[PDB]
């Protein structure tokens with residue numbers, strides 16, 4: 765769903781303070797997210 769044209773890559777997530785960032789490796793994609 766998130767990455768359909770990525771196949772079998774890797775997923776890493778980092779959060780600081782009150783902000784969430786998602787990074788995907790293989791396609792080099794970054795997405796900004798925040799719930800709090």
Ligand SMILES: [Zn+2]
Nearest residue numbers: 767770788791
């Ligand atoms: Zn990807």
